[PDB]
Amino acid sequence: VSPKEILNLTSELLQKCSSPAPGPGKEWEEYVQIRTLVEKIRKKQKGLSVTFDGKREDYFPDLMKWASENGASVEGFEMVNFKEEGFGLRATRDIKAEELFLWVPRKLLMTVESAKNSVLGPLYSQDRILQAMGNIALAFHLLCERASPNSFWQPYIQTLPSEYDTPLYFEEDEVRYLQSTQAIHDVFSQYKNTARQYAYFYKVIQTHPHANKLPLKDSFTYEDYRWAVSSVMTRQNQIPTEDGSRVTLALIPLWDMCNHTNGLITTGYNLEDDRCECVALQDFRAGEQIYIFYGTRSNAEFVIHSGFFFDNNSHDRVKIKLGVSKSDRLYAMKAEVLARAGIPTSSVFALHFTEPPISAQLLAFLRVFCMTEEELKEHLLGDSAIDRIFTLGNSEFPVSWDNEVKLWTFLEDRASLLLKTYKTTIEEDKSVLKNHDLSVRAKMAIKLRLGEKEILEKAVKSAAVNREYYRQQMEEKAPLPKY
């Protein structure tokens, strides 16, 4: 287990992960190639460089005491290992909705600025990737403090999980379920980026003199980096700075033990007291788990970045890339109409599962995408031109009945085309989830690919319904609603 062999592997790994994209048709092979190199490095290393003797629950009392000494709320809840979500907070008393039950002063947080003033400071001021990417800076901040026995944040670090359910921890066959989906490319990117980052910083630590005082200089395993970046991506937060002029990334102890449920964001930052504050999202009776609303993220973002799949996600969505073709003879006019509306000529839009299926920006694009030349002129010339552009994102004011029929006909055909690019059908995915016994990580992948097709299927039906509604208004010569 010579260090020179590991240096040769990280050098091979860095160059492999620094190569350009091999084309979307060879991304799976590249992924497997990178996996093989990573697993060979991981098999030659000793896992996490720092492990703690006690189990996770043994260190929660020290977290409460540590957080109490620095002004945080520690009464009214307890840590419980729930089966569905893992460890979380459970109310020991009745908590009414909108009650301020949880607050964490800034002194407890781990932030980019706390990383600047730590042992990582010297290396931070020289490496561009650390300066430009605060999430990576927080990840190394967490690693350096983890390997420091007398760190101020040890009570928080000793309570963190030792493993996560991000795709970085998935088996090869669990990721294979995602083949031919939209989400698997982000899984590829996450894995390639993490592998490139580890090898890059492994060599940076070994060559920069201002990293010699780091504990990572003596031990920095791939397991360390995967755990660190998984800790940050599943728990990081955006808070304002002390003066309130700039925003920064932060890890918020104690409060980040809350699991996710549907609702509204009830967590903010109070600058007057300089502390994170969280009011109860709903009534929490004693003995009930305390939840918060993480945000309006899709199940793909929850799986890839948060490490879980949320059933009945009201904000689920899929991507759909659309653009005006340069072969279109009306390209110049369409591009100008889109530019005056603040919409690019080509972009990635979203199809939502909750009505409406498309946003105002996507509706405005599809209207211009299907405009005739004479309709485009009325959006470019005259005293009413800007007024017409102002209503492009409004469903109540169409350009014309024919324009609506054409844009909903296109969306139905495109959504039907996207469904035909998946390896399996919706009925096949449901059969797998029903007849096979799967792991949590495998279920996440299969539910993820199922959710994509179900959003596309609902977009197909909603577009067909809208097509028939506006065709009725056109066959009956309905008066066009004016604003």
């Binding site: 996450q190 980026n193 980040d256 009830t266 967590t267 945000g295 973002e301």
Partner: peptide
């Protein structure tokens, strides 16, 4: 309202 709403686990760019 919340002057600084905190989205937990906000997605950041790793590229």
């Amino acid at each position: 309202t919340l002057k600084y709403p905190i989205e937990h686990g906000i997605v950041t760019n790793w590229d």
